[PDB]
Coordinates of C-alpha atoms and ligand atoms in Angstrom, one line a residue:
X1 CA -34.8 -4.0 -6.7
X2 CA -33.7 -0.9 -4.8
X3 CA -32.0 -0.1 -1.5
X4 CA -32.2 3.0 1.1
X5 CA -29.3 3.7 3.2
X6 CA -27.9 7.0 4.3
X7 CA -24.8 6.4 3.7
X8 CA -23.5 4.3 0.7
X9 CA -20.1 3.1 0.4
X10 CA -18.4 1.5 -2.3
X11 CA -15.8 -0.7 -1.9
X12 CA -14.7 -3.2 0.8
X13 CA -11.3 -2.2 1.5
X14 CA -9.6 -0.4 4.1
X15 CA -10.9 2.3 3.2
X16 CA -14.5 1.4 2.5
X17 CA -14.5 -0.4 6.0
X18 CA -13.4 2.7 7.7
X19 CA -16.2 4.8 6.2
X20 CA -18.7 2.2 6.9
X21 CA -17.8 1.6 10.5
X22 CA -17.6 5.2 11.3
X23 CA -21.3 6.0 9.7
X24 CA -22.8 3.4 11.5
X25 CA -20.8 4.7 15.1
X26 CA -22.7 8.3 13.7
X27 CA -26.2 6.5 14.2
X28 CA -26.6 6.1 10.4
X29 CA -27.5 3.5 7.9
X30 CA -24.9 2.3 5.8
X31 CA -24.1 -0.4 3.5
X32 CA -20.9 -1.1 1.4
X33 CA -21.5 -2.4 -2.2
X34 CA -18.5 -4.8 -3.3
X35 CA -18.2 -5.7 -7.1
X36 CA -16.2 -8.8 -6.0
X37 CA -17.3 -12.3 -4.9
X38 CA -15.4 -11.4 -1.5
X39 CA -14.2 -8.4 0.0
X40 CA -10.6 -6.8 1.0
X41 CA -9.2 -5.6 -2.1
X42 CA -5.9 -5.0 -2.6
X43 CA -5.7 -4.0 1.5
X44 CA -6.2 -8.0 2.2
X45 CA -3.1 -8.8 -0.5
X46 CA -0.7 -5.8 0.8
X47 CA 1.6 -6.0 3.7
X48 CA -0.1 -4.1 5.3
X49 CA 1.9 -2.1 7.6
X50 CA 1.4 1.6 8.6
X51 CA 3.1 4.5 8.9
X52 CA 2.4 6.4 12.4
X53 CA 4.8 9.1 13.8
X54 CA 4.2 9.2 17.8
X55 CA 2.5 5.5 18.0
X56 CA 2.5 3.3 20.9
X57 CA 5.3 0.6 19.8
X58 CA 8.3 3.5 19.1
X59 CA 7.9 4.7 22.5
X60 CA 8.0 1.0 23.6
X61 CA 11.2 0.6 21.1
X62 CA 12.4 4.0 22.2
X63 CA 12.3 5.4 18.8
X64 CA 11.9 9.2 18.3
X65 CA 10.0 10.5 15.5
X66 CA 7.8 13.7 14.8
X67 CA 4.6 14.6 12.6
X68 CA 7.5 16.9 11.1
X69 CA 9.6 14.5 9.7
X70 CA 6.9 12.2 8.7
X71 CA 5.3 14.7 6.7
X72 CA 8.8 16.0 4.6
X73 CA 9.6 12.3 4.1
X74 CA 6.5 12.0 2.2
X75 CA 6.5 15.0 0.8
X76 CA 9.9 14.6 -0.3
X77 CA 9.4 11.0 -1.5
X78 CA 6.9 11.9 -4.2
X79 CA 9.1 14.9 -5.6
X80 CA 6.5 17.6 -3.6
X81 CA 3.9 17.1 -5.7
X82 CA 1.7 15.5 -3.0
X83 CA -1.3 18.0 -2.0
X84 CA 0.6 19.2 1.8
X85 CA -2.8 19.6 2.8
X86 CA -3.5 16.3 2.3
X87 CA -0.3 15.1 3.8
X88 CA -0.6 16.9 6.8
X89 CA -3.7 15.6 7.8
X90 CA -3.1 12.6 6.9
X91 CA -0.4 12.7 9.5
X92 CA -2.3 14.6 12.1
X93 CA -4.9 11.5 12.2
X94 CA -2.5 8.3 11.5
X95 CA -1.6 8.0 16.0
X96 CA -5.5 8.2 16.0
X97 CA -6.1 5.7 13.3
X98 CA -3.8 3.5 14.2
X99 CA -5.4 3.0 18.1
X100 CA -8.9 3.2 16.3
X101 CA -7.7 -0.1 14.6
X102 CA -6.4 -1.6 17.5
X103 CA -9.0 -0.8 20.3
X104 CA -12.3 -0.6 18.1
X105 CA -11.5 -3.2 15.6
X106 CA -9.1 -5.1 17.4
X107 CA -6.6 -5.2 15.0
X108 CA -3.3 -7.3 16.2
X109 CA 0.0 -5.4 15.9
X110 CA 3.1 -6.4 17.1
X111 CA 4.0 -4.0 19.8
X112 CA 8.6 -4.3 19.9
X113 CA 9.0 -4.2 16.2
X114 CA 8.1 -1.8 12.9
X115 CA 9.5 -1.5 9.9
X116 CA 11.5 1.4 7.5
X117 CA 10.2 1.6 4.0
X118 CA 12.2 3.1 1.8
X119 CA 12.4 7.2 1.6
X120 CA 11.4 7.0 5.5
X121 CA 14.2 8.6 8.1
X122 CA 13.0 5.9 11.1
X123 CA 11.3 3.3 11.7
X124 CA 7.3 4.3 11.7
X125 CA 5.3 1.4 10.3
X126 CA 3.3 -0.7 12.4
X127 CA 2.7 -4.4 11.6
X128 CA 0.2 -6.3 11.8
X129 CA -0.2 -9.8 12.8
X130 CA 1.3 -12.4 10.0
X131 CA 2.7 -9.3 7.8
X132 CA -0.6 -9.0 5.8
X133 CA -3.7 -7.4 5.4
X134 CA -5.8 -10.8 6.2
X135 CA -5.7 -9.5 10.1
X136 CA -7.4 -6.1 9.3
X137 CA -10.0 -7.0 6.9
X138 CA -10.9 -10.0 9.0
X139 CA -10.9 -7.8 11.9
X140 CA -13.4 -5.2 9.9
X141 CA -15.5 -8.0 8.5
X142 CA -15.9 -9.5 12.1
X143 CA -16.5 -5.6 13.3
X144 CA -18.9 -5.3 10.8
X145 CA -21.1 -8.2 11.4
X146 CA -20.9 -7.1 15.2
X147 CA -22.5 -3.8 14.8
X148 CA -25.0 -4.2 11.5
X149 CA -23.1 -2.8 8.7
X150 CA -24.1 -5.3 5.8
X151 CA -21.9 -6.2 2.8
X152 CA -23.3 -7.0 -0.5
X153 CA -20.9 -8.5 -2.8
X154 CA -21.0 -9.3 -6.3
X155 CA -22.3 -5.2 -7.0
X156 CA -20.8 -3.6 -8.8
X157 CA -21.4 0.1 -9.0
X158 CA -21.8 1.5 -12.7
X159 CA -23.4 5.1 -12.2
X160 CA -24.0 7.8 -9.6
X161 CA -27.4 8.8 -9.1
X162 CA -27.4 13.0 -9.2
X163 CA -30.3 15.3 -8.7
X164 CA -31.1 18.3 -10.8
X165 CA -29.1 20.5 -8.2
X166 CA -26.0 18.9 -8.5
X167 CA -26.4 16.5 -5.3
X168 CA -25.2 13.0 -5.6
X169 CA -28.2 10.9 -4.0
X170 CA -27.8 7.4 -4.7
X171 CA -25.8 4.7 -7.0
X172 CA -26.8 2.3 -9.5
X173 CA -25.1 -1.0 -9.5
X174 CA -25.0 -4.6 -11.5
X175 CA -25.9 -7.5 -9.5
X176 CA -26.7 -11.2 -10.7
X177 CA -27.1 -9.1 -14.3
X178 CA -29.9 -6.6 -13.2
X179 CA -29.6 -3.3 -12.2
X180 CA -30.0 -2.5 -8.2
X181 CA -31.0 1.3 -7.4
X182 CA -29.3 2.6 -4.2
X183 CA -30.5 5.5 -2.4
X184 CA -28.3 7.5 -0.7
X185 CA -29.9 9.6 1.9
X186 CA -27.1 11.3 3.3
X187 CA -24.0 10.5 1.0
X188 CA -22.0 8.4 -1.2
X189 CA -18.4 7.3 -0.8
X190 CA -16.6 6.1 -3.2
X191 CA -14.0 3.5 -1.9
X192 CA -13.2 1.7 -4.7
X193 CA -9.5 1.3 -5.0
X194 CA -6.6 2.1 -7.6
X195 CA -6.2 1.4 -11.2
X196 CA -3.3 -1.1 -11.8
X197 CA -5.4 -4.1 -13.0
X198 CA -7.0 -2.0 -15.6
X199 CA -4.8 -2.4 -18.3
X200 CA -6.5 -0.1 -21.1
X201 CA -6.5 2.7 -18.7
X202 CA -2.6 2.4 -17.6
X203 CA -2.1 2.5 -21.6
X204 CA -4.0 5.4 -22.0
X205 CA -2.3 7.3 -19.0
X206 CA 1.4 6.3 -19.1
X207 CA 1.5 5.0 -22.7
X208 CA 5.6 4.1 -22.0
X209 CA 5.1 1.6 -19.3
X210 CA 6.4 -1.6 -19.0
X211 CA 5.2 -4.3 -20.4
X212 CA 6.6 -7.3 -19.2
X213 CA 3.8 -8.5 -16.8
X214 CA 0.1 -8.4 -16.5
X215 CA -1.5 -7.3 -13.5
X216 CA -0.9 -9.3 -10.1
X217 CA -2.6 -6.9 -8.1
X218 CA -6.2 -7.1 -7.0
X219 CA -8.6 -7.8 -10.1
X220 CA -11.3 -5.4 -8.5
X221 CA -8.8 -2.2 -9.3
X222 CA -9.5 -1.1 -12.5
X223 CA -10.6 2.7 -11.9
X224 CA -14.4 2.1 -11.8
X225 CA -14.5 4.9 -9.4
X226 CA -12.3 7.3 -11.5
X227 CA -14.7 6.4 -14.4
X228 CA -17.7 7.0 -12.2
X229 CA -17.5 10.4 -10.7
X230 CA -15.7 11.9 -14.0
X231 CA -18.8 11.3 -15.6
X232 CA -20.6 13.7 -13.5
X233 CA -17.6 16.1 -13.9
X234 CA -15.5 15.3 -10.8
X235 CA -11.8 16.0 -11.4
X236 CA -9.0 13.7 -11.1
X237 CA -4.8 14.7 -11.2
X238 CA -1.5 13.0 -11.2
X239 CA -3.1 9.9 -13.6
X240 CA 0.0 9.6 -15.4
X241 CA 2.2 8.6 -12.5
X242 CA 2.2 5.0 -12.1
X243 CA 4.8 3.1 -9.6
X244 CA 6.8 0.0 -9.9
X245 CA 7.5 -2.3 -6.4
X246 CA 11.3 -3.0 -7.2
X247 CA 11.6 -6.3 -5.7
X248 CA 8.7 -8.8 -7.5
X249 CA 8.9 -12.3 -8.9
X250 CA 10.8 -12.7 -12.3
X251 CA 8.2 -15.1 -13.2
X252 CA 4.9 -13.4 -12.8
X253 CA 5.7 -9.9 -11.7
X254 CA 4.1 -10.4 -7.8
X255 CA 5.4 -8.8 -4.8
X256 CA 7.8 -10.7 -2.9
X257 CA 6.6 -9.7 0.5
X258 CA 9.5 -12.6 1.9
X259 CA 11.9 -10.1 0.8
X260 CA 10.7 -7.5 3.2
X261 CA 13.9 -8.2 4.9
X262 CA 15.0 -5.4 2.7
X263 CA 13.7 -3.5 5.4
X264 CA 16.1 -5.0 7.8
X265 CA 19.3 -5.2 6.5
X266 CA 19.3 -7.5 3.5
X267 CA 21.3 -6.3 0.3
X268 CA 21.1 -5.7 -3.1
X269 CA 23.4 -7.6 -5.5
X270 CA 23.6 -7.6 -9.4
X271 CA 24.9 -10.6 -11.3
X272 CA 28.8 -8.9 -11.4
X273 CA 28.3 -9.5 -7.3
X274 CA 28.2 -5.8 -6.7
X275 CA 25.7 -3.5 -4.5
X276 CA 24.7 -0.7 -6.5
X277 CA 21.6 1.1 -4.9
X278 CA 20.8 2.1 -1.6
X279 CA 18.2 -0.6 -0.1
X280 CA 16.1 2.3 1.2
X281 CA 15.6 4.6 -1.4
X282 CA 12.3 5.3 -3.1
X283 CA 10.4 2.5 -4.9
X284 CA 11.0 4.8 -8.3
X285 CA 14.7 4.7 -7.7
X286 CA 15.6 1.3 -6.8
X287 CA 13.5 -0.2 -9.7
X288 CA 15.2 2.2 -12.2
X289 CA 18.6 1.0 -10.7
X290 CA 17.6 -2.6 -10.8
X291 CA 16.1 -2.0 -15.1
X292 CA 19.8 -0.7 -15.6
X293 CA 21.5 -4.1 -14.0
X294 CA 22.4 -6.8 -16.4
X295 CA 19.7 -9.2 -17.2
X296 CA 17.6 -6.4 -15.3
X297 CA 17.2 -8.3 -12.4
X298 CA 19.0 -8.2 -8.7
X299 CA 19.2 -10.7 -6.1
X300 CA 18.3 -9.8 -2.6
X301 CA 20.5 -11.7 0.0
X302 CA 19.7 -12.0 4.1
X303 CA 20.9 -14.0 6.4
X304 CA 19.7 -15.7 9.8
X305 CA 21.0 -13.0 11.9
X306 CA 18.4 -10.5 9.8
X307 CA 15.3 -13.2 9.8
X308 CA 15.8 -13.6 13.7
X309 CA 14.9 -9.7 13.4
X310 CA 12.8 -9.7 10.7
X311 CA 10.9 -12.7 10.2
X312 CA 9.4 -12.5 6.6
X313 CA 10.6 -16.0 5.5
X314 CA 8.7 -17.6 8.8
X315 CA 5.2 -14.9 8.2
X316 CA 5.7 -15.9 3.9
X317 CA 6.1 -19.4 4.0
X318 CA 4.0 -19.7 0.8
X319 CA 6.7 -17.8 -1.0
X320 CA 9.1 -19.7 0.3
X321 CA 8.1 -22.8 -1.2
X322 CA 7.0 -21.6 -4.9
X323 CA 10.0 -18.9 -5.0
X324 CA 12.5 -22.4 -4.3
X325 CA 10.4 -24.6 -6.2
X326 CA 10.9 -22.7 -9.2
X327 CA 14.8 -22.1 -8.7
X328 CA 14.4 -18.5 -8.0
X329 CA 15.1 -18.8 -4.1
X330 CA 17.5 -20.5 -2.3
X331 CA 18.7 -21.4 1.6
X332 CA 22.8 -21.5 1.7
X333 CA 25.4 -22.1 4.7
X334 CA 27.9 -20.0 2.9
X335 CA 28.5 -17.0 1.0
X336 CA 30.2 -18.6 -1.8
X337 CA 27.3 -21.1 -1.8
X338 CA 25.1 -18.2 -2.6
X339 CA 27.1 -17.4 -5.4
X340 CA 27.2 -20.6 -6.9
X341 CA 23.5 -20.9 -6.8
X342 CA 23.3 -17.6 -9.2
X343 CA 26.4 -17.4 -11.4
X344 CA 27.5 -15.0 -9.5
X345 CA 31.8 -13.7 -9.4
X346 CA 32.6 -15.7 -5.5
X347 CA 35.7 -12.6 -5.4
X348 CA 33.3 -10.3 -6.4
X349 CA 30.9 -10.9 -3.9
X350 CA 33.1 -11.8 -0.8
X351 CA 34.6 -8.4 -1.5
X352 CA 31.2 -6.6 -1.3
X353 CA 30.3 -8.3 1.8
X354 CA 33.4 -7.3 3.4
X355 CA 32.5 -3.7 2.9
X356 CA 29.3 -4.1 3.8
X357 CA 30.5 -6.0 6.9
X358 CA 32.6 -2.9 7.3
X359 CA 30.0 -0.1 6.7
X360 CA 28.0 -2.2 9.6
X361 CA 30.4 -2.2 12.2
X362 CA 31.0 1.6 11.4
X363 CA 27.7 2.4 10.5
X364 CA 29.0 4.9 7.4
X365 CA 27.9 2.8 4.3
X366 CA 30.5 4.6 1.8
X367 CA 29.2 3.5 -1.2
X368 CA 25.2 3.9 -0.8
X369 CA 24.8 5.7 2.4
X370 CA 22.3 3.2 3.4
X371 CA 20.0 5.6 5.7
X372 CA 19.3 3.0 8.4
X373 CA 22.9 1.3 8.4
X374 CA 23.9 -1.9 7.3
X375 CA 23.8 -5.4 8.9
X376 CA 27.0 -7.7 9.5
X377 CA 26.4 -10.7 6.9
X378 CA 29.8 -11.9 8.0
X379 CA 27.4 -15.6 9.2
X380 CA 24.9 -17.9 7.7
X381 CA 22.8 -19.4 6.6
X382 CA 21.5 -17.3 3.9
X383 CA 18.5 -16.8 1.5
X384 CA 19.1 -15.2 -1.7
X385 CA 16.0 -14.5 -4.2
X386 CA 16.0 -13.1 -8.0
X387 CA 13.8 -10.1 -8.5
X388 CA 12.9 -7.6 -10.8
X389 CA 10.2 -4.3 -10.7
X390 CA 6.7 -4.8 -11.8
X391 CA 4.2 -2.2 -12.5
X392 CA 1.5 -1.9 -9.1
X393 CA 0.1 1.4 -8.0
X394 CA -1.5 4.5 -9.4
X395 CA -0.7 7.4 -8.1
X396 CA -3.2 9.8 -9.3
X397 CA -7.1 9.7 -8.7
X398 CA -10.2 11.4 -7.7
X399 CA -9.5 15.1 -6.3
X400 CA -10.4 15.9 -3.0
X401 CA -10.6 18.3 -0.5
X402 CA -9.0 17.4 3.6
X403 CA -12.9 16.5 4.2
X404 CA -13.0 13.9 1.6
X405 CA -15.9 16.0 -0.2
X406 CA -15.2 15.4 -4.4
X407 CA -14.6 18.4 -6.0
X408 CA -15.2 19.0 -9.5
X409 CA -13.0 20.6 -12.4
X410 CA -13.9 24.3 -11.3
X411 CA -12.6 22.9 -7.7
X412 CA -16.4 23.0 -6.7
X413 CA -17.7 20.7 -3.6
X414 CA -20.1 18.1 -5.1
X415 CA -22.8 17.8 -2.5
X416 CA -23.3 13.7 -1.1
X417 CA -20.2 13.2 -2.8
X418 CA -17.0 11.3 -0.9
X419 CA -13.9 9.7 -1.8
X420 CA -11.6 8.4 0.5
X421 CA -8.2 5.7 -0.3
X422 CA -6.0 4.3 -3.1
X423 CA -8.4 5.9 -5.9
X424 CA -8.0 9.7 -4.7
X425 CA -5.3 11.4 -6.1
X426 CA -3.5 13.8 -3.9
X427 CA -1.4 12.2 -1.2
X428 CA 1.5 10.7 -2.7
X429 CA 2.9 13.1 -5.0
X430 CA 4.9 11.2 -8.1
X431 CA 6.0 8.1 -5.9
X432 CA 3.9 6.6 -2.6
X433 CA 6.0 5.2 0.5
X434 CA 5.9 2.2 1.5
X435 CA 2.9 2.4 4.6
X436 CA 1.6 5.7 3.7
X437 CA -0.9 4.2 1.5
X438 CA -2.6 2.3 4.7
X439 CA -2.1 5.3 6.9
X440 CA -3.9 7.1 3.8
X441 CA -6.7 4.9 3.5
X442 CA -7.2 4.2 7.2
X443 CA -7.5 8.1 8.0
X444 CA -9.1 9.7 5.3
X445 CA -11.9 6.3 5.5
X446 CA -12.9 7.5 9.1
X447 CA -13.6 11.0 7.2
X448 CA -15.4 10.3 4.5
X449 CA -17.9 7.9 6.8
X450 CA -17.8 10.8 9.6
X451 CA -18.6 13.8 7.1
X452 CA -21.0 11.5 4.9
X453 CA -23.0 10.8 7.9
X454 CA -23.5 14.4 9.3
X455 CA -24.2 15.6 5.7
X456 CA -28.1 16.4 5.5
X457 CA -30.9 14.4 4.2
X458 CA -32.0 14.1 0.8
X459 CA -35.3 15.6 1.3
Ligands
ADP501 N1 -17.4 -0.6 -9.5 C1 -17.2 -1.0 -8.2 N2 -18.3 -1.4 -7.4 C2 -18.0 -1.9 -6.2 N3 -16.9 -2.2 -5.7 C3 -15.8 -1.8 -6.4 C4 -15.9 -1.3 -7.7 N4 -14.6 -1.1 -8.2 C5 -13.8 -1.5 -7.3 N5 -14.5 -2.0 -6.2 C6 -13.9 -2.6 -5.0 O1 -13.4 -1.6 -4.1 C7 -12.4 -2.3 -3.3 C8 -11.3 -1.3 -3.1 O2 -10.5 -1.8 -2.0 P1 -8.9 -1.6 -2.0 O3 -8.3 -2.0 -3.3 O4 -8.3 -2.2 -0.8 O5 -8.8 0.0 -1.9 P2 -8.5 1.0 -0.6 O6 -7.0 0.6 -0.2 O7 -8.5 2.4 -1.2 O8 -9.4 0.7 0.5 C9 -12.0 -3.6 -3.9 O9 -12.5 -4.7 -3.1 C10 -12.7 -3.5 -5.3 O10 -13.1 -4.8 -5.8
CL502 CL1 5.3 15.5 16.5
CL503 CL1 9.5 0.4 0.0
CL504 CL1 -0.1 12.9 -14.5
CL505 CL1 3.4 -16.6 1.6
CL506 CL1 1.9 0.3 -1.3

């Protein structure tokens, strides 16, 4: 069995969707090939909120921000080792991106609130509806339907197809066990996510990881793409850098999106009943702090004041429920309640909370210097949840120039070759952002489609 389309894209993420929709809005063919049953990758699982300086909802909050300062907090955030390039146009296109989603795919977002990830000086990241990727990859897939784009799932892509000049012209994927020829007319995009859930390849890359969890990420990331174009001499960088998200279930290592009221106010607190990060550092940072904590563990405490803001325990109501099932959660009236609960000194923690009821009212947090400022705690109820890091995201990837083009270990464009999203290499230094990898995937999609389709036919 074969296949012609002019452009073929693999991988049914944010990214993958992005290319698609923007070949077929060029006039071209296009397919995506997913190796899953279903599509959305780890963009369905993640939050999926997204870093725009200059969008709609801060000039409705009255928040001030600039491509400036968006571009040296994420510089800055992955210890300048992100391409600047790659940064910068990344933040050029996000205020574009981000009103592509909402007026051509019709994406939901909640237009008076946004959140601040760690390592980011304001608040920048639009959310969409529920606090999850299920709005935006339903919104593609209905998108997608709408304008002809078809999906084939359960293909998985296993070689690129390249011509005696150096051209990539087509893919070769695995469906039902049989091999299915794609040719590529125009170009190939390779869309296919990060490497966490691989782990041989994690092993092989950062060899003193942690080892306390298996993957909880999405099953589909397991560097297929990497493994792909390096076989026809594409270059990858940064493979070695591999991030933890600090605040995950004890149990299985998940992300504990409930406890995105981090973002908001909520504190850190070890088992003496003592703060001892700030809440809005770097992902890198906090989980180091939390590894070096007794039992290596924190709690993360919030109270109603911060969910009336917030609302991650009403949008993660499924974590609610398996987090207190299993003892690792808990809704208190009091303070010293929410010690009991945990073991953890009542003094000890009263006395934190006082200064952090302090550093609130003043807005000087003395012993962290919480970059946003804290939030009185000073009245319940409250939620307090055990948490520990967990291994996630790959930092490093396919190499690319700003046009999404592959390039190979001489730095050489490989013609009909594209690779847009979480399995390029160059954006995020040592250490992604929280939202960055959204406005990443969202932006440099839209390329990789746009330049794919205006490449020239395979004659
Ligand atoms: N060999 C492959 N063939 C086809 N699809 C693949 C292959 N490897 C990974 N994928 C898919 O690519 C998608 C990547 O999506 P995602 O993880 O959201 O990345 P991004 O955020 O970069 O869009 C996943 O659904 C994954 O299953
Ligand atoms: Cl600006
Ligand atoms: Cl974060
Ligand atoms: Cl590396
Ligand atoms: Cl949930
Ligand atoms: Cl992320």
């Amino acid at each position: 069995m074969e296949y012609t389309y002019d452009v073929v894209i693999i991988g049914s993420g944010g990214a993958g969707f992005s290319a698609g929709l923007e070949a077929i809005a060029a006039g071209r063919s296009a397919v995506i090939i997913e190796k899953m049953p279903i599509i959305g990758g780890n963009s369905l699982i993640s939050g999926a909120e997204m870093n725009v300086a200059g969008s709609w909802v801060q000039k409705n909050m009255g928040i001030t921000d600039s491509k400036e300062l968006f571009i040296s907090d994420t510089l800055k955030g992955g210890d300048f080792k992100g391409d600047p390039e790659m940064v910068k146009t990344m933040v050029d296109n996000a205020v574009g991106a981000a009103e592509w989603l909402r007026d051509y795919v019709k994406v939901e977002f909640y237009p008076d609130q946004l959140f601040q990830f760690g390592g980011h000086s304001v608040k920048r990241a639009l959310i969409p509806k529920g606090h999850t990727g299920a709005e935006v990859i339903s919104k593609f897939s209905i998108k997608a339907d709408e304008v002809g784009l078809p999906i084939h799932t359960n293909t998985k892509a296993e070689k690129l197809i390249q011509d005696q000049t150096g051209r990539i012209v087509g893919v070769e994927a695995a469906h039902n066990g049989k091999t299915i020829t794609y040719h590529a007319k125009r170009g190939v995009v390779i869309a296919t996510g990060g490497f966490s859930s691989n782990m041989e390849m994690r092993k092989k890359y950062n060899p003193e990881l942690d080892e306390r969890y298996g993957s909880t990420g999405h099953a589909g990331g397991t560097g297929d793409g990497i493994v792909m174009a390096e076989k026809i001499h594409a270059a990858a960088k940064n493979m070695g850098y591999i991030q933890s998200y600090p605040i995950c279930s004890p149990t299985s290592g998940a992300i504990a999106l409930i406890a995105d009221s981090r973002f908001f106010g909520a504190v850190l607190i070890n088992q003496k009943g003592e703060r001892f990060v700030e809440e809005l550092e770097r992902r890198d940072v906090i989980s180091h702090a939390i590894l070096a904590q007794p039992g290596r563990y924190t709690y993360v405490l919030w109270n109603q004041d911060i969910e009336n803001v917030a609302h991650t325990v009403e949008m993660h109501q499924g974590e609610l429920k398996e987090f207190t099932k299993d003892g690792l959660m808990y809704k208190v009236d009091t303070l010293e309640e929410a010690a009991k609960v945990f073991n953890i000194p009542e003094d000890k923690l009263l006395s934190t909370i006082k200064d952090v009821n302090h550093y609130a009212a003043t807005g000087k947090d003395e012993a962290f210097n919480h970059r946003s400022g804290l939030v009185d705690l000073s009245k319940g109820p409250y939620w307090i949840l055990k948490a520990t890091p967990s291994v996630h995201h790959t930092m490093g990837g396919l190499v690319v120039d700003t046009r999404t083009r592959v390039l190979d270990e001489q730095g050489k464009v490989i013609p009909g070759l594209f690779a847009a999203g979480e399995v390029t290499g160059l954006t995020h230094g040592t250490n992604r952002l929280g939202g960055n990898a959204y406005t990443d995937i969202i932006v440099y999609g839209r390329i990789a489609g746009q330049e794919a389709a205006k490449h020239h036919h395979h004659h």
